[PDB]
Each structure stands twice: as structure tokens, then as C-alpha cells.
Design a binder for this molecule. Structure first.
Ligand SMILES: [Mg+2]
Lengths: 164, 155, 119, 73
RNA sequence: CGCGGGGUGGAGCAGCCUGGUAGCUCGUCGGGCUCAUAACCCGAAGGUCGUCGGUUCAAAUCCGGCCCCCGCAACCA
RNA sequence: AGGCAAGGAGGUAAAAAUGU
RNA sequence: GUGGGAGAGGGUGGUGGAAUUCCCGGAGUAGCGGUGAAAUGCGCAGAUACCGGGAGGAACGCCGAUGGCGAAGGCAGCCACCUGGUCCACCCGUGACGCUGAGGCGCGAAAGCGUGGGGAGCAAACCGGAUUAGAUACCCGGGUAGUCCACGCCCUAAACGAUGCGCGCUAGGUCUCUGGGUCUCCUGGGGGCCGAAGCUAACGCGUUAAGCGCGCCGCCUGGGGAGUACGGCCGCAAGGCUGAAACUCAAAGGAAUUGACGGGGGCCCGCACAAGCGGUGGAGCAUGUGGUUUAAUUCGAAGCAACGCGAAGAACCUUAC
């Protein structure tokens, strides 16, 4: 997502895109620079390796800030995760449920992951039973997306909110 | 490795020039254990140099070596949890070795057919003030004075 | 736009950024330069080389406003204040005398939890 | 560790409890508005305490510098 | 259907908004850390942006059709 | 200028959960 | 008693600058702040840093100590006052007036809580952001109770020398302060450190004893249950004091000693990292292994130290299937 700025295009024919949507045509570097200076903006090279190199007359710093914000907001809006087990009991389960609910309320995607070890014989069964029960319990503020997915020794359930 | 300062190695000097530097260069050139092939190659390169830039083929080599040398080189240390580049001085011997290595590298990433030719061209470049080895040296130098931020760890 | 020729240099030396402010014989500043003026937006903001660079920048700025005689005030100990001092000495700058003034309170209010445990 | 300029001995006879004399106690405040310790002053515990008291009084008055500035470094 | 907002790697989205650059998180695949697992680390496989066009030199994107879907509108009868 | 120190400094400042 | 002497002893009345933040004036500009890294955060209505003035509120740097005071909690700018205890010298006066202390009264950190004031910093709760698999946490930015003062409570404590006080006696040395002296060295009174005897489970203690005694009080009677339950009493309430049983187990505990380990400290080492060359990992194949499959894929080998291993010779034989 990085491109060369100001006088820094190493070309002697850069094609000038104005600040609106126009194709101004096939121009010089110096001329492009002058145009940029005229609008109190700068010159960005958005498609560098072709015939006539691309001089977009945009505001660079602001654009980059916007991009960075976009990159931030997307990742962090989040996936939050809870790790269960095969043999799960009552108070602990309740606590986990509460935690999940809290996370949902916060405004985030919920993920229920199980860590397996000891005879892959009735591991999918109990896993399903508990996970499905959990889902049943929270079919008021949460809904189901990726159905019970045992893929070797990697079981994962993905749970998404009702009102984000 | 924590006991001895451990010895810088002795080389039997050249069979055409009488200079250990030359021998070292030849050794460097030598991959796969064929000095008695690579030394011929070096000789050929020297001859080519003599033919083209009307200079002594030892003198040119020396000039090249001088050109390729870095004074502030860069290193690798993990300080604070994260690895920071550490720019510091080079011992003369070590610097020379580095230069030789970089020249060798330049020789293998040049364009033409016969290796001798490539080596000759590289030598010429070094003598002049440009080329591949020279470029690498410059890069190295740039890496220092820009990452001199962490140059409060002299080690 | 201004000019004065004689004056002070102030180095606030914190953890996070070594800040250099250059000023007139009264107390009103002419220019100030930081680690963040010449790049360095981070932990390496508070770093001796960075500090030195900042100092150099400040000196240059001063030279543009026609400034000759400089008296040195170090305020604190952030990581490179010595480096900064050295840089200042170097710049072909009429480097007068070196003075250290701490804003150490004469035991005032009990500080934050990172100066705490140190009572 | 302080061993060449024993600040008690060099200055001659005088009274501790005389605060209007500032050059007499100018020995006793260091470079900053900081008092010299037992390793630097060379005084009896009691004597040292008395001196400190006197210095405090002086500070309250003005005569001896309250907080100075470290020249040279 | 009436009007507006969009459909993007297997699922959710950043990019669309300035026309060139499609990434990340999770899922599948494998190894490694390991005493083992988790995490972790590193990659592999996985899209042409619902999509057909046009604009345009280059469309995800400007723009139009259509699918649609969603949100709404199904009001005075 | 050194012999050994006596002190004020900011670098060390990676996070690390159990048993088939 | 006289004669001194030290002291952050205690309260009352001030007041001294440094610092912080607030608010203006200036001048100045693009970031500051932060950190293992960052993000929230504040800043163009001009922040931060810098000088000028004030507004406040707290606490008092150095000296300062391993020191001093106090019964203990505790106590430090400095002055003034009122006032405690103390220690000595003189041995001058009194003439056993002492020592302890069940109860009781009194104090009693810090927090809390009541009432009013103050409100800068800090800062539970609380909101953020990061860290994280999860974070109600550590890290970072706010931020209210509250810290502060006044009255009134509370009254707990690692209220600890984890050592009750009173006296006597039992080698020294050494530092520390503090007084008296015929003041290079004595003598008293504290505070430490090293140790004769002796003790003690040892560690240790050792004229400041946990020694040797006596005096008098407090409590102990396995752990856990449990400072709980009941009651009683005190408290505006939190809770506190006072203090069990039923049951339940064969350990709960302390000291050290070996070793084991340590994301403890020093010193070393090794191709351990670095420096260096070149590979594996990618391609194909050769093997051996897992896995499957199959009538049988003989058996074992398991991180280094199983995996071109036993097999240094599977067409049959070998060869177990
Ligand atoms: Mg894994």
C-alpha cells in the first residue's frame, strides 16, 4: 500500500488524474507538479509500472491517515474467543456462559474453541452436546454461523450477535 | 570460543604477484574446492583488465578493494524483547574480508557468459567508483547513520 | 521574523522524548525542536541519537534567526541529555556555561505509581 | 568518598548559631542548595544537627541560597 | 413491485468514496516450539470483487442494467 | 593523568499454562 | 531538690520556598504524552516545552544515618508558645513510700463511617485503551469515594525485637549517640554489630539474653473446623471483642541437611549462539517410519538419545506373517 510522492516519480511522461474523476490526459512530470502546487495538494503515483506512469493529484497525508484508520477499525469489530473442554460441569459452565454474554453485549463476535486430548472415541459427541446446549441457552442475544466443526483434533464453533 | 581470541589465518602468498590479499581473493572466488581452476580464472580476469583499462592488474584490484570497504557496518542483537540493528566499527581485517565477499557476490550477479569476463568488469567498476560491490558497500553505509538510533549499544 | 543574538537553551529531558527549546535573554522562546520534528515517532523518540539530532535541528533553526551566544540549561535526565549537550557544543555554537536545574519537588505530592515504591 | 577538603578544619574559630554570617556557612551548603554530609563536613552528630538547624533558619531568612544551579558538568 | 444502501478469499470485513495496488481475522492443509497440548511461528491452499457490460489507458471501485438481498414502503380503500 | 573506588543516573526491562 | 543537657515527644498559633496542577499575559508551532511495543488520551478555539504573575491545596528534598524521641501506634520545613518523659552530676532531703497488675478508665497506624469545610496531586470503585485463548488484572489515560482539616466515633494489625514488665547477677571487644569527668582515657544512660560461659530443636541469643534466678500477669494445650456458629456486649452501620461444639484427619508444624529446581547472583565452558560456507525444508527419486489398507503388510525401536535403526544384503530361503 506504498507509492512514490511529489517529484519522486522517475518518469518524463506522467499521466495526470485531477482531483475529481477526470482523465486530464498524457502529461509531463514538471507540469503535473505545477498543477499539484496550484491546488495546494501533492502528486501520488497510483499505478507505477505501465506505459504513461500515473500521477494522481490527491492529498497524500490525509489519504494515508484514512487508510491506517481503515486498517485499524477492521481488525480491532473483533473476534473474541472462549476455550472449553470435553468433561465440563455446572458453575464453571455458567461462568463461561456469562462471559460469552458479556462479550456479545460489548459488540464483538464470539468464538467457542475446544482443546482435546485422550481417546478420540466419544469426543465429537459430548462436544456437540455441550456446544449445542450453550447455543440453546444463548438463542436470545446470539445466533449460529459455522455449525459444529470437528476437523481432526481442531473443533471450533463461531457465534454471531443478534443486535450489534 | 570464549577462551582464545582465535587466530586470523595464514595464507601462502601469490604465484604471480607476491601478495596475500590476492591469494585471499582467489580463495574467496573458489567455490567447490578448485583454486587451481579459479586462480587461472583470476589470471584471465587480470589479463582482460590489462587489455581494457590500461592499468596494472594488481593496482586495479587494490583500488577495487579500497573502494568496496565499509567503516560503520551493521549487526544483529535482541535488546528489549525486539531485535535492533546495531551499527559499529569494523576491524581492518574483517572489513577487508567483507569487501572481498561483497566483490565475489557482485561477480555472481553480473550479466555475461564467461565468469572471468564478469569478474574483470566488476574489477573495472571497483577501480572507477561504481558497480555492484560498490553499491552494496554504499547500502551498508546507509544502513548505518540511519539506524544509529541504537548506537548506544557498542556491545 | 524576530532576532536577538544572545540567549538560553532549555533541555527538558523526559523518558519518552528529549525536548529542546531555544530562547531569548528574557524568557520568550524563538524556536523549539524535538525527536518528533525529525521523524522518530515512538520509543526511539526517547533515544540519545534522536536527542542529538533534535539538538542539531534546534541549533540550525537558531542560526536562521541570527543567534550567537548560548547558555545551557539541562532540565532533568532523560536518556541522551549528555548527547544533546555534546551536539550543542559541536554546532559551531557560542557555547557558554553548563547548568543543571531539576524540577525535583522538595518532597511535594506523592507521585504516580511509577515513581511510587521509590517512596 | 570525600577526603581532601575536610570542611570543618580549614575554616577557623567561630559560632555555629550565627546566621547573619553567610560566607562562614558558604563552606557548608554544597554546589546546589544542598548541605554536605558527615563524610564531607566532618562534624559531631549533635554539632552537625545544630549546623543544619542554623542553615534552615538562614534559608528561611534568605541569606544562604535555597536552591541553586549546578554549573560546569 | 415502490425507494435507498451493498453484495469480496471456505465465514465476517478492510479497501470502493482518490480508478492501477484486494489485505486481515477466523476455517482447511502441513511442519516446527514442545516431554505433549495450547498459544505460538512460518508458510501452503483458498478471490477478479453478485456480476454483465460500459466508462476507460487500468473498474472492485466512477456508471448503468439485471440479479438480488437487506433495510424500508404495501399508505388514503 | 591514572590507581581502586564513593555516589546520581537508564539500559537488563520478551511473555510463558497445564498433564496420554 | 538544686544544677544542667539532648531530643522529627505532644498540641496550639503562625508562616518559608521548591514542586504540582489551575488561570491570565507573553512568545512560539505540530505534535506532545506514553511503552516490552503501542493504542486511548489531549493539541491548531494554538497544546507540550519556555519565561512573567497569581490562584490554591498538600507534603516537607538535601542534612538523614546503620541515627534521635516516644509506652505503643507513631513522629521530621522552621519559629513561637504551652507541655510530657527522660538522663546525669551533687548524694543534699524523704525513709521501703516499692514491683506487678484480674477487672476498669485512657490512648491507640491505616482504612471506614457520621457532620461540615476544603479539593492540587494522588486514586478503590468506574469508564476507557492495550495485554490476553479468557482480563472483572498487572502496563498505560482519565476518574468518584477518599486522602487533608475540624468535631464525633471506630479500634483492627506482621499493633512485630513475630521477644510482657520489674529487679539482681553472669568475659570481653567494637562502632554508634548522649551526659558527667582529674576530656590521649574512664565513667554512667541508650542503639547496633561480633562473640566467654551458659542455653536452646537448631537457627540463633548472648550486660538491650531467648543465660542463671525470683516476682507478678497474659495466654497454650494436635490440626482443620474457626476467630466461624450461639449467646452476650459494644458499635449509626461495617464489624469488633468474648469464644465453642458436632464432626474430621494422622499428620498440621519448625529448624536445618542432602539434592532437586528456579522466567535467582557471580565465574566458566562446548560449533551452543554470533561470524562463515554450504546444505535440509521446496523439485524428483532412493530408502525407513507413521498412518491406512489388507488374507498378511511379522516384531520391536519413541524428543535429544525412533525414524539409510536391529537388517552388515527380504525373489525362495531368509522369515517370524
Ligand atoms: Mg497447532
Amino acid at each position: 500500500k506504498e507509492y512514490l510522492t511529489n517529484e519522486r516519480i522517475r518518469a518524463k511522461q506522467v499521466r495526470v488524474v485531477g482531483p475529481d474523476g477526470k482523465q486530464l490526459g498524457i502529461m509531463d512530470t514538471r507540469e503535473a507538479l505545477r498543477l499539484a502546487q496550484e491546488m495546494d495538494l501533492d502528486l501520488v503515483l497510483v499505478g507505477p509500472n505501465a506505459d504513461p506512469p500515473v500521477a494522481r493529484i490527491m492529498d497524500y497525508s490525509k489519504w494515508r491517515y484514512e487508510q491506517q484508520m481503515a486498517e485499524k477499525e477492521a481488525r480491532k469489530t473483533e473476534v473474541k474467543s472462549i476455550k472449553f473442554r470435553v468433561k465440563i460441569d455446572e458453575h464453571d459452565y455458567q461462568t463461561k456462559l456469562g462471559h460469552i454474554k458479556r462479550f456479545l453485549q460489548e459488540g464483538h463476535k464470539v468464538k467457542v474453541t475446544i482443546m482435546f486430548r485422550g481417546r478420540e472415541v466419544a469426543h465429537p459427541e459430548l462436544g456437540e452436546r455441550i456446544l449445542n446446549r450453550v447455543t440453546e441457552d444463548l438463542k436470545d442475544l446470539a445466533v449460529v454461523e459455522m455449525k459444529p466443526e470437528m476437523l481432526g483434533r481442531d473443533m471450533n464453533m463461531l457465534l454471531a450477535p443478534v443486535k450489534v | 570460543a570464549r577462551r582464545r581470541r582465535a587466530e586470523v589465518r595464514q595464507l601462502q602468498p601469490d604465484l604471480v604477484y607476491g601478495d596475500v590479499l590476492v591469494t585471499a581473493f582467489i580463495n574467496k572466488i573458489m567455490r567447490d574446492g578448485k583454486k587451481n581452476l579459479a586462480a587461472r580464472i583470476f589470471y584471465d580476469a587480470c589479463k582482460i583488465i590489462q587489455e581494457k583499462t590500461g592499468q596494472e592488474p594488481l593496482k586495479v584490484f587494490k583500488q577495487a578493494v579500497e573502494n568496496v570497504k565499509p567503516r560503520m557496518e551493521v549487526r544483529s542483537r535482541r535488546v528489549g524483547g525486539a531485535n535492533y540493528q546495531v551499527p559499529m566499527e569494523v576491524s581492518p581485517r574483517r572489513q577487508q574480508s567483507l569487501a572481498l565477499r561483497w566483490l565475489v557476490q557482485a561477480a555472481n550477479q553480473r550479466p555475461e557468459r564467461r565468469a572471468a569476463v564478469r569478474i574483470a568488469h566488476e574489477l573495472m567498476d571497483a577501480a572507477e567508483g561504481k558497480g555492484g560491490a560498490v553499491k552494496k558497500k554504499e547500502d551498508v553505509e546507509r544502513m548505518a547513520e540511519a539506524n544509529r538510533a541504537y548506537a548506544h549499544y557498542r556491545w | 521574523k524576530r532576532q536577538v543574538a544572545s540567549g538560553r537553551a532549555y533541555i527538558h529531558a523526559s523518558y519518552n522524548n528529549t525536548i529542546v527549546t531555544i530562547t531569548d535573554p528574557d524568557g520568550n522562546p524563538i524556536t523549539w525542536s524535538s525527536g518528533g520534528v525529525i521523524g522518530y515517532k515512538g520509543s526511539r523518540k526517547g533515544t540519545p541519537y534522536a536527542a542529538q539530532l533534535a539538538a542539531l535541528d534546534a541549533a540550525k533553526k537558531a542560526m536562521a534567526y541570527g543567534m550567537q551566544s548560548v547558555d545551557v540549561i539541562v532540565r532533568g535526565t532523560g536518556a541522551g541529555r549528555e548527547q544533546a549537550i555534546r551536539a550543542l557544543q559541536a554546532s559551531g555554537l557560542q557555547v557558554k556555561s553548563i547548568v543543571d536545574d531539576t524540577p525535583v519537588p522538595h518532597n511535594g505530592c506523592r507521585p504516580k505509581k511509577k515513581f511510587r515504591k521509590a517512596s | 568518598p570525600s577526603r581532601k577538603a575536610k570542611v570543618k578544619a580549614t575554616l577557623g574559630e567561630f559560632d555555629l548559631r550565627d546566621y547573619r554570617n553567610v560566607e562562614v556557612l558558604k563552606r557548608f551548603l554544597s554546589e546546589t542548595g544542598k548541605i554536605l554530609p558527615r563524610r564531607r563536613t566532618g562534624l559531631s552528630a549533635k554539632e552537625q544537627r545544630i549546623l543544619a538547624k542554623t542553615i534552615k533558619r538562614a534559608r528561611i531568612l534568605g541569606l544562604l541560597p535555597f536552591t541553586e544551579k549546578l554549573v560546569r558538568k
